[PDB]
Design an enzyme around this catalytic site. Structure first.
Site, short mmCIF file in Angstrom:
data_model
loop_
_atom_site.label_atom_id
_atom_site.label_comp_id
_atom_site.label_asym_id
_atom_site.label_seq_id
_atom_site.Cartn_x
_atom_site.Cartn_y
_atom_site.Cartn_z
N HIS A 41 0.81 -1.21 0.00
CA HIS A 41 0.00 0.00 0.00
C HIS A 41 0.85 1.27 0.00
O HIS A 41 0.29 2.36 -0.14
CB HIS A 41 -1.09 0.02 1.09
CG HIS A 41 -0.61 0.20 2.49
ND1 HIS A 41 -0.78 -0.80 3.43
CD2 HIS A 41 -0.06 1.28 3.10
CE1 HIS A 41 -0.30 -0.31 4.56
NE2 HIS A 41 0.15 0.93 4.41
N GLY A 143 2.18 5.94 9.58
CA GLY A 143 3.63 5.95 9.45
C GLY A 143 4.28 4.68 9.98
O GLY A 143 5.41 4.36 9.59
N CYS A 145 3.34 1.55 9.41
CA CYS A 145 3.23 0.42 8.49
C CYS A 145 4.61 -0.02 8.01
O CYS A 145 5.51 0.82 7.83
CB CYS A 145 2.31 0.76 7.32
SG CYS A 145 0.62 1.14 7.84
C1 KY0 Z 1 -3.43 5.02 10.20
C2 KY0 Z 1 -2.87 3.74 10.77
C3 KY0 Z 1 -2.78 3.54 12.14
C4 KY0 Z 1 -2.32 2.34 12.63
N1 KY0 Z 1 -1.92 1.33 11.85
C5 KY0 Z 1 -1.98 1.51 10.53
C6 KY0 Z 1 -2.44 2.68 9.94
N2 KY0 Z 1 -2.54 2.81 8.53
C7 KY0 Z 1 -3.58 2.33 7.82
O1 KY0 Z 1 -4.47 1.68 8.34
C8 KY0 Z 1 -3.62 2.66 6.31
C9 KY0 Z 1 -4.43 1.64 5.52
C10 KY0 Z 1 -5.79 1.85 5.29
C11 KY0 Z 1 -6.60 0.82 4.85
C12 KY0 Z 1 -6.06 -0.43 4.60
C13 KY0 Z 1 -4.70 -0.61 4.77
CL1 KY0 Z 1 -3.98 -2.14 4.34
C14 KY0 Z 1 -3.88 0.40 5.23
C15 KY0 Z 1 -2.38 3.34 5.73
C16 KY0 Z 1 -3.61 4.15 5.97
#
Ligand code: KY0
Ligand code: KY0
Lengths: 304, 304
Positions: A41, A143, A145
């Site tokens: 992603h 951030g 990820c």
């Molecule tokens: C914001 C955050 C907080 C904690 N862990 C992760 C995140 N990030 C996410 O969830 C995001 C996302 C969105 C939808 C699906 C997927 Cl695979 C990834 C990058 C934005």
């Protein structure tokens, strides 16, 4: 001697963390040998995340679009490929800090350390379990990820987790290092059901043995039970059914403490049915399940 | 986003750990520049520990009696000296892995990470607080002496703790890196009183703010209190009295959440007087006090 939720020393993993940027998006990558691993992603914008066609988005990208930085040095990307939900960026330099490593897909109920990172820089380390529903209760912000989960045996790091997503419920989902999600999750900004979770019975029992070893013995009683009788209590309290495989794994702790596994099950049965009555076990007012029998043996013996 | 008892990444400290042996005894040392720091009780045998005359025991020792090993390489000891309860062994080689460091004496209520070690090899990392009574609730076995506590700011490691002793009660005591014990403790195998401990009020409040930020809001109520009214409750429940200095430190969290510090005190007052009624806050069934306001800001903002 005390008992704490201990993480592995993170040094070997810190030396692998890099920053990966693709256009507007920045996340963490894991640099092992001449390959950088990161969540696919990284190629998306917020508009794409609602329903991304990763194949089509990745086609608009060339090697020079992926900016990989290790501390302050820029890595030269010479190849890129998508494997499931991870991107593998071939770089022209092998990481000189690459430890002896393996990629493993852990089982639900097993534990691992997480090195939370932002912009390729480590912020902290904590221990957690892969829940029976394949989610993890971590601590992650935008951030983070690409931050990874791992175990360490002697000098070999077994990477088991890469962080990808926060569910609308605040729990976390990610992949093994082959990019296969744990659980039914997809890397898409859609509401996603995490299954009903259960308490990891074998881990609670392992922790009760850790409590007896460290002096917390108030919960020991004059009773015993059977696997079938105990499992009727485990079902009512949303605990995983205990099997002979679980009893066998608890053997070392039963041999050390001299408390038969079914006698410890009877202590757990009474704790489930009566609560803690306002008392604590190893500083906790609830039954802890994020310590495996191996973790208890390791911490209680001093394995480095 | 979640909230966990997070330790600092231990890599910078792992590269400093060495094994120190004096005759029959082996423990851990910290190698910074050309000096190795370790507990002075490395020079004792079990017979000596009952009432050691460290000055007299150290006189029977020469540079060649201290065996210092870093992984597999032997360090050459060229000087030795005792500073309070620590020995400083001058070696002929500066540690090439020495990070930017400082020695700090932390205050009770402050937190730090511990890298537990055995035979100079790291086993795990956990976060803890220096209790108001100057003990720490760690996880240590025989061989762990010399393991250190630290904090990390940017690239600088502030070493604040060196492990020395387990009290007959199972709690832990140690020194700053100048060898001065925290608390009234002496490095001797004698029964030693640890004072009455209190709950770190400012840390509980900081953790209640962390809970509100992460969604756990059930404990918020329609009440307020005053410092004097709240401190009458803190005294009854063995909590440290809250001061305006503590209120001031909670300012960033009050500004972010929009919840006035005295309104959060009223939530804490009701939790103290009524308990949790079987509910949890950030996965805990008790009031957690080993997170400082700085820790909460750090974790909730993603500081690396
Ligand atoms: C914001 C955050 C907080 C904690 N862990 C992760 C995140 N990030 C996410 O969830 C995001 C996302 C969105 C939808 C699906 C997927 Cl695979 C990834 C990058 C934005
Ligand atoms: C055995 C152990 C376990 C955990 N932490 C530490 C230890 N070690 C000790 O307490 C020892 C000791 C004895 C008396 C006073 C002092 Cl300063 C030190 C080394 C034997």
């Amino acid at each position: 001697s005390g008992f704490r939720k201990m993480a592995f020393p993170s040094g070997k993993v810190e030396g692998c963390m890099v920053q990966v940027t693709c256009g507007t998006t920045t996340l963490n990558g894991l640099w092992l040998d001449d390959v950088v691993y990161c969540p696919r992603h990284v190629i998306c914008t917020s508009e794409d995340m609602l329903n991304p066609n990763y194949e089509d988005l990745l086609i608009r990208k060339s090697n020079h679009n992926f900016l990989v930085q290790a501390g302050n040095v820029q890595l030269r990307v010479i190849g890129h490929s998508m494997q499931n939900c991870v991107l593998k960026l071939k770089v022209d330099t092998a990481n000189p800090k690459t430890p002896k490593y393996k990629f493993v897909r852990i089982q639900p109920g097993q534990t691992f350390s997480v090195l939370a990172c932002y912009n390729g820089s480590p912020s902290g380390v904590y221990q957690c379990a892969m829940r029976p529903n394949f989610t993890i209760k971590g601590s992650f912000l935008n951030g983070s990820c690409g931050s990874v989960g791992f175990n360490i045996d002697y000098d070999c790091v077994s990477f088991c987790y890469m962080h990808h997503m926060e569910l609308p419920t605040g729990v976390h989902a990610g992949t093994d290092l082959e990019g296969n999600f744990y659980g039914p999750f997809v890397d898409r900004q859609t509401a996603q059901a995490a299954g009903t979770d259960t308490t990891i019975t074998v881990n609670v029992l392992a922790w009760l043995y850790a409590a007896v070893i460290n002096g917390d013995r108030w919960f020991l009683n004059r009773f015993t039970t059977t696997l079938n009788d105990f499992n009727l209590v485990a079902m009512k309290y949303n605990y995983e059914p205990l099997t002979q495989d679980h009893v066998d794994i608890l053997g070392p702790l039963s041999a050390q403490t001299g408390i038969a596994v079914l006698d410890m099950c009877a202590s757990l049965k009474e704790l489930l049915q009566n609560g803690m009555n306002g008392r604590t076990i190893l500083g906790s007012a609830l039954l802890e399940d994020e310590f495996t029998p191996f973790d208890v043996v390791r911490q209680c013996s001093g394995v480095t």
